[PDB]
């Protein structure tokens, strides 16, 4: 459509996959990518590593909107919730602020099944 030079980057992390979607203030997506859709399967799809590729695949789909400065919003408990922030900061962007919608730690879920020392 027409460039806007401002928006929000939403990182939504599940125990199997990670979604990276950039939105405008009118309440819609500009660009989306996922850790699975970045060519990852099984125990690789559920990594913080596959989420770092999703930032550069979202950067390839938001190209039309003229955005260089954006703020971050983190969602979900999954393993991709931290690793991809600094990778998006390396994809041709500047991060103005960081926020999250994390509950306080009482829900538990997914013991690590890996090392750990």
């Amino acid at each position: 459509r027409k460039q806007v030079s401002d928006g929000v980057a939403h990182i939504h992390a599940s125990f199997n996959n990670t979604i990276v979607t950039i939105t405008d203030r009118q309440g819609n997506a500009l660009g989306w990518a996922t850790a699975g859709g970045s060519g990852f399967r099984g125990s690789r799809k559920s990594t913080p590593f596959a989420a770092q590729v999703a930032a550069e695949r979202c950067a390839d789909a938001v190209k039309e909107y003229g955005i260089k400065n954006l703020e971050v919003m983190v969602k979900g408990p999954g393993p991709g919730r931290e690793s991809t922030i600094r990778a998006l900061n390396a994809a041709g962007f500047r991060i103005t602020n960081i926020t999250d919608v994390t509950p306080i730690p009482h829900n538990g879920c997914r013991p690590p099944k890996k090392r750990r020392v």
């Binding site: 919608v101 994390t102 509950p103 306080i104």
Partner: protein, 55 residues
């Protein structure tokens, strides 16, 4: 002063995550901490606080 229904008093007993603080900084002499921790939850229903910071 001396009551929980004033936000400039109330904000001294809670965090930037909506949580209640330890007794060591409430001035309750460790004897009214139980009642103050309930008065802070009562402030949510008096339109002074949101029910959780994440919403």
């Amino acid at each position: 002063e001396i009551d929980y229904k004033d936000i400039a008093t109330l904000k001294n007993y809670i965090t930037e995550s909506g949580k209640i603080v330890p007794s060591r900084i409430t001035g309750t002499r460790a004897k009214y901490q139980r009642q103050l921790a309930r008065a802070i939850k009562r402030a949510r229903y008096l339109s002074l606080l949101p029910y959780t910071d994440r919403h």
